[PDB]
Each structure stands twice: as C-alpha cells, then as structure tokens.
Write a protein that binds this ligand. Structure first.
Ligand SMILES: O=C(O)CCCC[C@H]1[C@H]2NC(=O)N[C@H]2C[S@@]1=O
Length: 121
C-alpha cells in the first residue's frame, strides 16, 4: 500500500516519498506519458509497468509485509497480489537509491505538456 511504499522509499533513500518522488518527471506520481526524463523517472515508469502487470491487484491499498535481512528488503509471504506488489515496490525503492546521484530537483512538479511520448512497457 502507499504506506509500506512511502516508508520503504524513505528507508532506502533518506527522501520523503511525498514530495520527492510524487510529482517528479513524467512518471513519478499520478499519471504518465512520454519518454522518462532521467533514470529516477525511468524507475517510476518501470514501477508503473510493474503494477500494470497486476490488473486485478490494488497496490494503493493492499498492505504487504516486508522485513530487512542484512539491510536487504525481503518480501514476506502474503497473498499473491501482496507478494507481487511488494516486489514491484522493492525494485522501485532500490532503483531510486541507485539513481540518487542523478536525482534533480528541477524535475519536481514537471509540467505535463513536456512529457513528449512514447514508451511501451
Ligand atoms: O508517490 C509516491 O508514493 C512515491 C512513489 C513514486 C511514484 C511511483 C509510485 N508511488 C506509488 O504509490 N505508486 C507508484 C506510482 S509511480 O510509479
């Protein structure tokens, strides 16, 4: 759920999910079109695709459990939807961590008309 996800992103990156990753670029936050602006934006694009692999799941609201093993995120057993949502979220948080060196505040609040298409999952 948005709860596990936001706390997972803060743990990984030291950044608040809202607002650092909730209106960034073309894919981070509600909506999505066009070519991702940068690596962090591509993380969001892939996460959107990951959720799109799960049309009968409800990632905003379905809570999953995860733990830390040796600092690593480990998804714990739940429903199939919960396990798959957790893996999507885990990947996005790790992807955000891996691309902190190129995160750019200039992409916050990025305007929709500059999201010049197109990218298939
Ligand atoms: O907005 C947030 O909660 C921070 C995460 C970044 C945006 C991505 C992520 N956030 C979320 O709750 N689901 C997805 C939609 S985007 O891929």
């Amino acid at each position: 759920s948005l709860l596990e996800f936001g706390k997972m992103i803060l743990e990984e990156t030291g950044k608040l999910a809202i607002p650092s990753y909730s209106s960034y670029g073309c894919y981070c936050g509600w909506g999505g079109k066009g070519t991702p602006k940068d690596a962090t934006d591509r993380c969001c694009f892939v996460h959107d695709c990951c959720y799109g692999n799960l049309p009968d799941c409800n990632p905003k609201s379905d809570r999953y459990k995860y733990k830390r093993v040796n600092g690593a995120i480990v998804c714990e057993k739940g429903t199939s939807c919960e396990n798959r949502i957790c893996e999507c979220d885990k990947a996005a948080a790790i992807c955000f961590r891996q691309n902190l060196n190129t995160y750019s505040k200039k992409y916050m609040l990025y305007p929709d008309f500059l999201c010049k298409g197109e990218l298939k999952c």
